[PDB]
Amino acid sequence: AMSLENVAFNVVNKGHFDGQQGEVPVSIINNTVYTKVDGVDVELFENKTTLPVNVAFELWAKRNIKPVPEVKILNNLGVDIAANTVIWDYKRDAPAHISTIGVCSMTDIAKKPTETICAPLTVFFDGRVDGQVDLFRNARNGVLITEGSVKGLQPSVGPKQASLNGVTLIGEAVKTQFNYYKKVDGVVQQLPETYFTQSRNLQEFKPRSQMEIDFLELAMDEFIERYKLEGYAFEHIVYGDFSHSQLGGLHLLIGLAKRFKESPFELEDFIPMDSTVKNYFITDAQTGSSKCVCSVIDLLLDDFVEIIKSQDLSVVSKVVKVTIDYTEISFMLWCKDGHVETFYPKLQ
Amino acid sequence: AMSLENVAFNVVNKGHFDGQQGEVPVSIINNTVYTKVDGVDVELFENKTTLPVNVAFELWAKRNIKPVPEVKILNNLGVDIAANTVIWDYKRDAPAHISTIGVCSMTDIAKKPTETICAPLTVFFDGRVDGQVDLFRNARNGVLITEGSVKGLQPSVGPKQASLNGVTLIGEAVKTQFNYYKKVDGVVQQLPETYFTQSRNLQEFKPRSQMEIDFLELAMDEFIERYKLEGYAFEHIVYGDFSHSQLGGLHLLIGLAKRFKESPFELEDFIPMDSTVKNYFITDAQTGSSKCVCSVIDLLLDDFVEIIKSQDLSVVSKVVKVTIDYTEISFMLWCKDGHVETFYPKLQ
Amino acid sequence: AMSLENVAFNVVNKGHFDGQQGEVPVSIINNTVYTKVDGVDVELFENKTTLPVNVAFELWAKRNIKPVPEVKILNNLGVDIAANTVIWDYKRDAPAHISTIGVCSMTDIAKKPTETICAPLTVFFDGRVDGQVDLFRNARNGVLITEGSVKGLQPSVGPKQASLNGVTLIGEAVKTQFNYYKKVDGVVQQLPETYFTQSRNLQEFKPRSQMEIDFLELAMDEFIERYKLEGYAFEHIVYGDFSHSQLGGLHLLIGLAKRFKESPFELEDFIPMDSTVKNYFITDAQTGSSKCVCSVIDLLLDDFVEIIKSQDLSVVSKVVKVTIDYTEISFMLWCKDGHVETFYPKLQ
Amino acid sequence: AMSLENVAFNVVNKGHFDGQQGEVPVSIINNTVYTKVDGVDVELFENKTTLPVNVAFELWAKRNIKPVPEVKILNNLGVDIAANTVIWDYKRDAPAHISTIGVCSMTDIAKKPTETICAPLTVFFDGRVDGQVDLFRNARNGVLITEGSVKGLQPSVGPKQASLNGVTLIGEAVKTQFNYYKKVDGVVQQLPETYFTQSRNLQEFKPRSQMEIDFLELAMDEFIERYKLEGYAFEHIVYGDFSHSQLGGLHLLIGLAKRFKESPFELEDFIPMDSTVKNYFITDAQTGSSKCVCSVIDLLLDDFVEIIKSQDLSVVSKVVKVTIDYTEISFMLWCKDGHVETFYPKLQ
Amino acid sequence: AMSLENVAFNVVNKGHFDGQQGEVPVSIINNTVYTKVDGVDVELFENKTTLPVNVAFELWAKRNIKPVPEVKILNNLGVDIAANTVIWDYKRDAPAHISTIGVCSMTDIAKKPTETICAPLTVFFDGRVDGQVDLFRNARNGVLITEGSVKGLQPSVGPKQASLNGVTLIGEAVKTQFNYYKKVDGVVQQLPETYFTQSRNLQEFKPRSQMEIDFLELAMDEFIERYKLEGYAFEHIVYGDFSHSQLGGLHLLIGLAKRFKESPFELEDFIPMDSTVKNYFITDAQTGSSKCVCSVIDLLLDDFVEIIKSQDLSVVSKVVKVTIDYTEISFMLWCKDGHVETFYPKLQ
Ligand SMILES: CN(CCO)S(=O)(=O)c1ccc(N)cc1
Numbered sequence A, B, C, D, E: 001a002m003s004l005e006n007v008a009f010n011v012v013n014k015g016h017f018d019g020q021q022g023e024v025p026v027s028i029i030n031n032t033v034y035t036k037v038d039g040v041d042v043e044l045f046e047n048k049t050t051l052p053v054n055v056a057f058e059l060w061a062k063r064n065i066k067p068v069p070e071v072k073i074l075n076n077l078g079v080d081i082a083a084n085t086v087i088w089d090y091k092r093d094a095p096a097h098i099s100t101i102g103v104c105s106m107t108d109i110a111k112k113p114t115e116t117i118c119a120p121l122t123v124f125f126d127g128r129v130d131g132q133v134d135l136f137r138n139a140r141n142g143v144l145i146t147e148g149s150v151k152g153l154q155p156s157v158g159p160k161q162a163s164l165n166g167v168t169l170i171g172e173a174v175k176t177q178f179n180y181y182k183k184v185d186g187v188v189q190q191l192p193e194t195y196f197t198q199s200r201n202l203q204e205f206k207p208r209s210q211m212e213i214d215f216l217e218l219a220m221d222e223f224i225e226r227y228k229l230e231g232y233a234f235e236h237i238v239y240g241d242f243s244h245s246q247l248g249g250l251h252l253l254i255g256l257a258k259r260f261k262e263s264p265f266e267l268e269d270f271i272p273m274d275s276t277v278k279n280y281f282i283t284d285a286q287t288g289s290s291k292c293v294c295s296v297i298d299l300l301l302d303d304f305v306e307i308i309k310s311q312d313l314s315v316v317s318k319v320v321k322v323t324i325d326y327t328e329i330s331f332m333l334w335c336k337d338g339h340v341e342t343f344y345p346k347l348q
């Protein structure tokens, strides 16, 4: 017996939709949901989605509040819809998937993921919910996550981190590292060897290796010497070049974090979504050096060093493909006289 | 157990709110309420009120679908709020009253009209509903309607006509003529002797007396002769003068109806609401004669003739007060040499 | 090379989208599309849909401007989406279908109806367009219309009338009568033997048989005598009973049309969409007789007479199923002592 | 001392802005202006313009309520802005001009038309207002209207009709025929010899000559015989051809009016504005004959007959330029063997 | 002579409404008020309220700019409306009270608090304004604040802190500690013994006692030992337990502040309003420990220690009622073997 007033009752009393009975008075004005509290309207939700205000409110109330894969991973794995949950995309303030299965009457395409309407879609299944591993076994297309082993199915160990209510974290009190499984047209796929992005923030960046601790503490020249990175263009690629009007390199989040402690800068996130590679229009406040499209990836510095050291440096320009977050990322490698000139996630 | 989905269910299945159980999918987008029918959104309601879309939808669904007094009568009697019903104002596409009593959680000031919050307000009671005559007896301020006598209470016979779902009519299959009662500060008040407006439309005007039949059929000079109206300025007041740039007279709806059959004209209803006297910005299409504020009243021609013939015609200008629809309507009477020059509902 | 400015250019210069090249200045403000003409904004489109303003504008510009089946027929046949066209629903001022195939980048689920995404959906195909009959042969689910025979496919002759730019008409200069075909799960289905609604308006109703001419011209008692309709409750069912507060019968559009010439009435279309059976909240202006849900069907009077005369009148109450516009319409037949009491399209 | 509350006070008490002092409570919600009357909000204005709601309300309140030139004439004369008035465009429910001179603080580019900002703009002056003829003499660019002669200035007699509060009419109680004057770059320009459109409606069309009376009353073949119109394609051009899927001709409003009495049709006004030539997407309800862009002009039939009879009929195709409403209207004349095939206002 | 333009003039020139004369050009677009400055629109106000944009703008301009009681106190005391002022609720960006008395024509229910309409409402009076103490003496229901003594009335010393333009502070240059008085149905009430919340922020929390200084500086075990808090579950209740998926305890703002210096966390304020007890959906970033509804109260640690040490610890579960900010707060006390297990502000 779903209703706007009941969804509102649950939000007010439980912090989210929890299947409780009850109603609270609600008013909708433009794209905002209010509730009456002692005779005054209190805002419960502001719709930032392209869905109707009351439909978006319900999907937000019915969001998954357990640690879930980051939307970038789900997208990279080709997920179209989730089974009996809503993956809320906090970077977009909107549902990660357009349609639902057994969640909301307005967005439901089916009540159960076994309906023939779901057959052409990659359905996301959560092995932590009863019967979901079996639903994955019967579905033609799907992605499954589990905390433990699945008999007969060989796993792909996912990232250490997961999103819990919009907070990306490596769980200590909860499990955030999942086993990933995928099926295309009934066949259990073999997921590829992959690197993972670290999902760190510029403001609260923390090193996750001795190489990363040395990058943030040592001076540019001490570091490049210590890790035998001469001829690998880390001065340009990682540290960044701010001497010309166009900002040079600066494609790794750790290099942006090192710069951030000294001089601030503006990052215009012109396509605000979760993605393996992010594009920013950067303006350096100290120098005035800027770049319209600066691609940034948060790889562990050790992983980036491994990737750049595993390339043939004898060709002027070439595309280097790297599996990161299960997807194929194309990089542009530019070399001269056997040394790197630049290496960046290809803008295509 | 009120809900948006339940109100929508009742509208779809019952044509209005009928206390039935059930829910239908609803989407709200801007000021419109839609419901999903075979996968497509079908509009159920467009909010034209100053209330939130879902609140206005509920009050419209909970509107009184029995013949009820016209909003002009309720306003003239000082009604602030209705008891356990919504009087819908079809001329404004909005509730006739701001707040409610036992109707909607968002607009309710009380569940029962006996709450101390209601004491200062003139509450409208409907004697056709059980216990409402008693609630009027216990209310400090109120207006009561009934189909018959209430022991000890001196009645006031109201208009022949009532509004049934926005259609003003004199009932043949339903009763539309009510007894009216009013109380101010605990004391039953004697309602004045009053005339009533006829509530006719310009497009579908019908005569309701032999004098009105003679006005519409006979020529101007022979009607004035037949009814001894020489010196009463009916040529100006009722027929209208279109020879000058400013349109002369034309203050009785019957005169506008007679003109309408011959030449069309524009009536700009610049304050669109139900009222005993209406003001229009009129432009005559045939002549180009116009008036920014032309006050119009729909009195039965016999009643207007009686009012104008009961005036002392020896003073240049004076205010003539007439009780119409229970309210005092101030007219401006202008005379010269014992004859009427003009008589119009005085523009306040 | 689709654009808002290009769609606007075509609307301004061609009256609709016609694949022409060019751009005109456009401004979007709230739900309205304007274009600059001699320095002033001229409204081109007001969005009444639940789609974004620019998306709805494009689908409306790309509407089918040839005679097409009425949305009620397409709905009754289970149509989900159209192939490479937009069926515009003029009764809802919105696209008849949510998604598109090869029409608009925002609403397209596929470019060609052969994509696996379309397989579960009943796709509408138009045999008047090259290659569409073959696409129907290869589609898993679909409805096809043609002007003539398709080799091997057993036809169903559809209604005489079709919708041309929102005008329902029986074509004289264009063909409006189509052959209909349907497929479910790869199998051509035999469409049932069916009656068709006449799609007439109350305001401009025209008789289409001598029985209908006799109904509108003759008095009630002599029409019933002439057509041997004694004991068939036409006085209640077709003519309508306005003597009580609840309006009796009045379920055939011809009966509403006969009443309309004499006395006006309000029809509140509370679910405004195209459907075989329509529900109205009716209020009779002359009597004040009303009904919250009055189901109305526009059958040719001869067809209704045939249906009611083909029923067993020996049971108190029973459901009578009739195929109209390819759908099963459930009627409620009430009898007493071998005579009809009432017969109405059963309110579901 | 301009204010929203003061503009609202004037609208409520005077029917428009009349420079009166006073304030009324106002509420603005979305694009609508309301005022409180006996505790309920009454709508005063709904913004249909691309200007802010309160700005549009003020310009509408300050509209010219005297007979003024039709917007099509002002546009054809190149008018950009009006001096100390607002010409309200009733066909667009918006101001005819973007900016103002001495009217509203939000839209004013100047307080007086003599400011240097106005010099490049063609300013409209009204000789009926004191000092406006002199302001035209001192303005670099402008259009002037007067009721009589202006010493030394060679006049142009304009149309018989003018717009009074949105009603186009030939004045009997007011003057609607003006003398027209124009200046470009300080130089008074000679306005061309011109025909005028009649500005009639399809629904209330009235003949304005014996030829027009004969067109509406006589049958096609006898009207063509009586007025020696053999070989002039009036059967196609004026009467219209509804035998094929594409509607033939039908370019004169009188021909559309003759057709309208017999069979109804839909005219989709896809560019809703005032113009000498109008374009409609027409669908004939009786036949199903239609045309995406059907250009229509309301010329007096005598004037159209004069234009078509003054053409050389010896060339296959050619552009015929005719001055109508002061603008050059390009027609397309198609001939074969010395007889007209078609003649239509050329679609630009 | 109130107006939108005048309110805007005052905001621009005085920072708020100050009764000055003058007007500035204003434009309203959707929910925003702009003013023209050198030909460009500058935003003055964005409506976040459920009132019309211009009405909300006026009440915000007319807000009380002196230190005033926090809305939580006024709510706890049952205040319905303020006398001749607007208490602006900065936590909701809306007026604290729906209606006004002598402030704005759109929201005024009366001009003076002595009107009979105000009789059933608890009116807030400010003894710092002339005549307000006397108005409290004559009002049936009310709450009065003063800086000094009121003859005959015994006072209730309120919190040290007050809100000055949305900044909660203990005044050094202004007086923020008021004497509170209340009247119900004409009778001067005796306000109860109460604790007060401290109204501190998590980001800028400052200790206000030696116990609070010791809590923030010492380690958990040193503190619990020093203040003899063994068996009082401060490890769970105040410090917080982050070892399990559900976050344990953490109900006092000081404990959240201590945690905040070490590890960040997300507090989803799902009912954003001023209240004695606040509810947050908390997610701990370091551990991933979370709780949908975590009730938080900012009591001085000494006050919380006093409350928990004054309870009978012999019952498994019981409701403990504590007067905080004049209202009764129910806590849930859970004990086992004479020791506290948990104590939290009861979620009811
Ligand atoms: C409860 N209030 C005061 C009534 O004593 S009110 O909410 O402000 C209000 C309610 C109804 C009307 N008609 C007007 C104001």
Ligand SMILES: CN(CCO)S(=O)(=O)c1ccc(N)cc1
Binding pocket: A099, A109, A117, A120, B039, C080, C081, C098, C099, C109, C117, C118, C120, C121
């Ligand atoms: C692609 N999708 C599922 C279809 O297999 S959909 O986008 O959610 C959708 C498309 C069209 C209709 N009619 C309904 C749903």
Ligand SMILES: CN(CCO)S(=O)(=O)c1ccc(N)cc1
Binding pocket: C039, D080, D081, D098, D099, D109, D117, D118, D120, D121
């Ligand atoms: C002042 N400006 C330029 C005029 O010289 S303007 O504001 O941009 C403008 C004013 C009026 C019209 N019709 C067009 C543009």
